[PDB]
């Protein structure tokens, strides 16, 4: 029957060329592993990362190359992040898979249908071109190749996202206003609110409201879902089943396990919101019916909170250039704020590859 | 191919202006050859053992090898005699040299490697000849 | 050019194992069929190349490929850096080539000194 050889052959081929078009990716825009590396830098400390002056002149050798805007360079990851889902899959399968009267049998067979005019000259080019720049339109129109030509960014990001730049949190402004029940609170003084989620600590021991408020916890949940949804649709080239996995674990050996330590007060426990002589009495407190009732109601709700806080600090530069845009925006003027919004539309609805852009500027260093 | 044209003839004046020329003639050692199917020639040209070219090494074309040409005979300093060719091998430093090739033709191949284009200066340079820079080794053949 | 497809992927598959039914087909059949299996074929090429791959498939049968993402992008950005290594190396030679270029069409081919009158591929290399 079939000869798994060729399967395996075929198999081989395909993520070889897999790996060559993410790499020529990678080359004709090396910001494209940079970018991500560096993210990678903040989540996995061991990870070595490239001299800063490659970075800089975005360069990879000798030849520093053109800097392309933020929504190609995202896209670009988008389509390099499936690429690397069919690898997986790819390799999944092929680990799952892995004479001479045979052979005049099989070649005798062969000469069945002997008057099958036709060229055939399909199988690497349609592979080879089903993953390369460029391969929707006639020519040069759309860098997306025929694998994800269906690929969009705007149904992934809104227009106020731009691509990773801000995150929206005006709307949970908003929901925060319906939490609090009043209107004290300006989109100012609620990112001023988010700030404490930075720190390891003052989420906790200062929260903005009672930590076992309905309405509150409520509003954290849908929040901390928001940041995390956002920070791994903001960086597609990271593995986000190892974030998650490294998040987990450290939430259950070091979070749950009295990490938060006061030299007066002794041990913290998120769940029963109380501080613990010493590590004695801590312990055999996370047996007690009240701890067991807490950490079986409120577990969902102190694990996403918890997640709003390490995403946020991985996010810290988002969160930040957000805040800013804010300030911004806020000291503008009426027509001010009305072009910068003109500007934030047109690279919302415009094309992530130019009909007037270069290919082959390269420059020397 | 305007511009071009001034920088290329530029450089090649001055580099043709600045050539050193010491006008030492080196050592030859020509000898029949033969392979198959006919008979070719081949010359082995020796270099000065870092005697002299150690107070020169400014990679000055330091790194272009020896040039061979085919010259005719029909234009020579004194054109008196002529009507044959001549295999004329260059160095910067030291001084030209000649053999001459009564024969119509010997060892002119046919497509010997499979048509791969780095010119060098000619087909006759990348074609057939070796440049052994270690040594300071010149072969032709 | 689905029959010499076939044809030349099994005696490949087949040529990969043992390399002796082939040249026992050769001499058992006669048929004009295979005569990719002479490097004088331009087919021929091709066929080493499959054959390898086929080769290669025979490497780490028993063993799995356990890359994962961080990995194969590591990989995929050093292969990017050496196609721009490779890429740096054709130009430098592009340069020397021009250097020679402009030496030869520069010097006296009339500086005439002359004595007497009348397998480097292999020799190009080192050993
Ligand atoms: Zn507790």
Redesign the interface.
Known sequence: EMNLLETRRSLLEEMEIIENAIAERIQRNPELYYHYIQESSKVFPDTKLPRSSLIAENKIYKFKKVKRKRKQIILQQHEINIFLRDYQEKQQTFNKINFERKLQQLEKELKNEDENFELDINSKKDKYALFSSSSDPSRRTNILSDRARDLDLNEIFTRDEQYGEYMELEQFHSLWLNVIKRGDCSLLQFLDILELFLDDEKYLLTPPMDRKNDRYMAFLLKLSKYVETFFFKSYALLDAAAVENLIKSDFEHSYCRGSLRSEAKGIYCPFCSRWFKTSSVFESHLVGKIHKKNESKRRNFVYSEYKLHRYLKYLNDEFSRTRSFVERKLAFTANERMAEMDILTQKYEAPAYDSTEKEGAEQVD | XXXXXXXXXXXXXXXXXXXXXXXXXXXXXXXXXXXXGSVGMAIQVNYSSEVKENSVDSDDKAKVPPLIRIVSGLELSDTKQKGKKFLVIAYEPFENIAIELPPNEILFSENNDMDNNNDGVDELNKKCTFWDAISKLYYVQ | ???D???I???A??Y???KS??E??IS??GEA?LNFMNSSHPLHKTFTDFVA??K??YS??????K????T??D???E???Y???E??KDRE?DK??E???????????????????????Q??LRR
């Open positions: 050019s689905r029959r497809m076939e044809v992927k099994l005696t598959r087949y990969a194992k043992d039914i082939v026992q087909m058992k059949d069929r791959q086929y290669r498939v780490f049968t028993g063993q799995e490929i890359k994962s993402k961080r194969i992008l990989n995929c950005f292969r990017t850096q196609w721009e290594f890429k740096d030679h020397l080539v250097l020679c270029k402009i030496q030869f069409a520069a010097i006296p081919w009339d500086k005439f000194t002359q004595v007497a009158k009348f397998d480097l591929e020799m190009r």
